Amino acid sequence: GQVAPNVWSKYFNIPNPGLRAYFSNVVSGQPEVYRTPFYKGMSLESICDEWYKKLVSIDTQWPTLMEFEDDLRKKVGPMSVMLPLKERMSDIDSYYDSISKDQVPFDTKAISAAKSEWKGVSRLRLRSEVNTVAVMKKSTNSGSPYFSKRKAVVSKTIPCDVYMDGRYCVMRQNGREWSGAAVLGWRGQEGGPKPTDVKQRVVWMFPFAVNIRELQVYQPLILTFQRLGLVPAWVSMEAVDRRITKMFDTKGPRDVVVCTDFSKFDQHFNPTCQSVAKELLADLLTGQEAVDWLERVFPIKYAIPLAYNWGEIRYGIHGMGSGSGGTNADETLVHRVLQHEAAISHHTTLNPNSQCLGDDGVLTYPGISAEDVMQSYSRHGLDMNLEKQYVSKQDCTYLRRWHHTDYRVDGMCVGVYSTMRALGRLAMQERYYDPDVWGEKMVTLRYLSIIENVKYHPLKEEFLDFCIKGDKTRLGLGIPGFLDNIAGEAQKGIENWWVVQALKSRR
Incomplete structure (x- = not known):
């Protein structure tokens, strides 16, 4: 060539x-595996294992949602x-x-x-x-x-x-x-x-x-x-x-x-x-x-x-x-x-x-x-x-969203994103950026964009509380002004995201 x-x-x-x-x-x-600060000090397995203890509660009413989650869990890494x-x-x-x-x-x-x-x-x-x-x-x-x-x-x-x-x-x-x-x-x-x-x-x-x-x-x-x-x-x-x-x-x-x-x-x-x-x-x-x-x-x-x-x-x-x-x-x-x-x-x-x-x-x-x-x-x-x-x-x-004819919100078969897939993405990133040069706001913005995907999951509120505990800055709750100026920080439809509304409700 x-x-x-x-x-x-x-x-x-x-x-x-x-x-x-x-x-x-x-x-x-x-060759390096890039791990985010999410649940620093815990392995990916332990993060996933801990969330799984609560995810598993949906298996009785939504067993095919559990199969979907189990399937995507195998790709986490x-x-x-x-x-x-x-x-x-x-x-x-x-x-x-x-x-x-x-x-x-x-x-x-x-x-x-x-x-x-x-x-x-x-x-x-x-x-x-x-x-x-x-x-x-x-x-x-x-x-x-x-x-x-x-x-x-x-x-x-x-x-x-x-x-x-x-x-x-x-x-x-x-x-x-x-x-x-x-x-x-x-x-x-x-x-x-x-x-x-x-x-x-x-x-x-x-x-x-x-x-x-x-x-x-x-x-x-x-x-x-x-x-x-x-x-x-x-x-x-x-x-x-x-x-x-x-x-x-x-x-x-x-x-x-x-x-x-x-x-x-x-x-x-x-x-x-x-x-x-x-x-x-x-x-x-x-x-x-x-x-x-x-x-x-x-x-x-x-x-x-x-x-x-x-x-x-x-x-x-x-x-x-x-x-x-x-x-x-x-x-x-x-x-x-x-x-x-x-x-x-x-x-x-x-x-x-x-x-x-x-x-x-x-x-x-x-x-x-x-x-x-x-x-x-x-x-x-x-x-x-x-x-x-x-x-x-x-x-x-x-x-990569699950839908079920019996799972409707205001009459729509809304798409459920895998919380297991979300957790893997919160914990692992594709490219390294030095936060000394780039800042932690961009880390948090990435977290929110991932979590926003699970906005129709039956356990989204538990999932959010689980994710807050893994973040020093608590998904922006710990960044003064951040949530209130989020469209702006994003530039430097996010103001309408469910996860933003859910976090603000926890203030």
Whole structure:
């Protein structure tokens, strides 16, 4: 994969000490387990064991909630252990090798069914690069070529034009021509109590110029879908819960709900899947600028080179570059086609209160079974382990929340987040920040964002009292002014969070 130094400098603005440090850390990895101050002096097991003594009280009335909690308890553990590059090469290979599995075309009727859900919608037009940049996150890394904060390089980036030229990504940026490459990034996810259990997620950190061009379509798309409520997970967890409720209200009395799961969905998002995304987008879009975007920009996330070490670049087509501006959009649109196709393949109609988001789905239709869904999806070159599908007539899991037809608050099947998963995240963090340089307010803000997830758990009040006891600052109760100025401290919808209201009530 190695390129000459004066070829590397056509992909990145050189010199760049920050980029140099970055790839050194990629090569070395980060072996330390980062433990927060939460219940300092106690192990993760002891924290979990102590809370479990009280959690277990729900097993009699909500035994499937206990099963859900027990399941996620097995994943509790470190999140910070990042393996060296030498031990992640298979993770990279997967993106290139997984798209060539046997893959059959999609049913044309299912594609029509998906399009029909947005009949009459205002067709999308590209936003301008300037307007798009204005609403983007500009704290994030600009990727190739400057590898700085976006905010710092806007004037050097736009106007921009990006396109594939054979295996190369050409990026014209305000008078410069660069060669584009994603940068290999990393995220850790808990997968068990040992340091070797940490899930090694690959992140494709895209060039700012590519993300701008992509978001000229995906930004207005997501906004339109949000306002129409077509993808509830893009709106809120309360919108998700409302649709879960309707799914239970309108499902076949004899039918199960199926909660699906994909192995390495991004990696398997092959050219057959890509062409379906392109067809749906072409339906949604209007204008000549859109025609050009579909031919020039849309394919980049499936073909952009990958810079995985200093001076090392990999080329060729691959699955979804996890990190594209359309990562979630392309996948969610195509996932909805998959759901329609499963129903249509069994001579019926998808219950439209079924839902999907990226690789996560929950659905029902007359006579549905998990193995039928698995067969209907997998024939397109997608990987699924039947053992990880979940089936029930009375409950479901979606976006790591449990719902039950008999567990309703003001008539909604609200989503219950695992307190066990919450405890693991309170105790373990993905990245180290020195609190001498960064402060304890940010620790507390992280705690609150985790705890807020359990706002519908039957034991949330006991859980909060348990968490308060683990925090020196008592979740901000011990930080003068903090709770009263929490939106502000957050900047330096949180004021409306349940956990904030619950803490203030304990004053």
